[PDB]
């Protein structure tokens, strides 16, 4: 919100029998993709630490 | 802000793998070396020539210069 990074974003933990996908998906304007991904990954790193 | 204002690109998919899922120097023989030769081959005849032609000129002038130091007996065949 503070930087108008994306129109929307979501975390997801899709599970499967023997595997799965853990991540996130955001929708943004062509010119803020970078800052968004940056802040996002940051939070992930903020999680492990 | 140089990334994003570059150019109008449409319909191009690219696939790449994390560096840790692949080899650093793959197919050294099957693929690598052959191209190294391919490339060497391609250029050899554009480059090498003028270099070789220079070498000659070097060798020629270099020796011809020495020859001009040695004496010619035909200058003393009567100097008794």
Most distant pair of Cα atoms in chain B: their distance? 96
- The torsion defined by the Cα of B63, B69, B74 and B76, in degrees rounded to 10, comes to -160
C-alpha dist (Å) from residue A38 to A26, A34, A45, A48: 12, 6, 11, 16
**Angstrom distance (rounded) from CA A22 to CA A48:** 14
**Angstrom distance (rounded) from CA B80 to CA B61:** 34
Structure resolution, Å: 3.1
Q: What are the backbone angles phi and psi of residue B20, rounded to the nearest 5°?
A: -85, -5
B-chain CB neighbours of A31 within 8 Å are 1, 4
Q: Which domain holds residue B48?
A: 1-80
The Cα of B32 is separated from the nearest Cα of chain A by a number of Å equal to 35
The three state secondary structure string of chain A is CCCCCCCEEEEEEEECCCCEEEEEEEECCCCCHHHHHHHHHHHHHHHHC
User: How many domains does chain B divide into?
Assistant: 1
- Best of B1, B4, B5 to substitute, by most chain A Cβ atoms within 10 angstroms, is B4
Which CATH number goes with the domain that contains B59? Answer: 1.20.5.210
- First-to-last CA distance in chain A? 24
Specify burial of residue A39 (Cβ count, 10 A radius: 0-12, 13-18, 19+).
middle
Residue contact A34–B1, C-beta within 8 A: no
- Which experimental technique did the depositors report for determining this structure? X-ray
Those residues whose C-beta lies under 8 Å from the C-beta of residue A44, and which sit 6 or more positions away, are A24
């Amino acid at each position: 919100v503070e930087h108008k990074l994306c129109h929307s974003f979501q975390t997801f933990n899709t599970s499967y029998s023997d595997t799965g996908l853990f991540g996130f998906h955001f929708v943004a304007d062509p010119l803020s993709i970078d800052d968004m991904m940056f802040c996002a990954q940051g939070e992930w790193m903020r999680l492990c630490t | 802000i140089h990334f994003g204002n570059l150019a109008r690109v449409r319909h191009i998919i690219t696939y790449s793998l994390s560096p840790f899922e692949q080899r650093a120097i793959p197919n050294i023989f099957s693929d690598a070396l052959p191209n190294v030769w391919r490339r060497f081959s391609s250029q050899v005849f554009k480059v090498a020539p003028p270099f070789l032609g220079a070498y000659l000129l070097y060798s020629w002038g270099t020796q011809e210069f020495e020859r001009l130091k040695r004496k010619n007996p035909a200058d003393y065949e009567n100097d008794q």
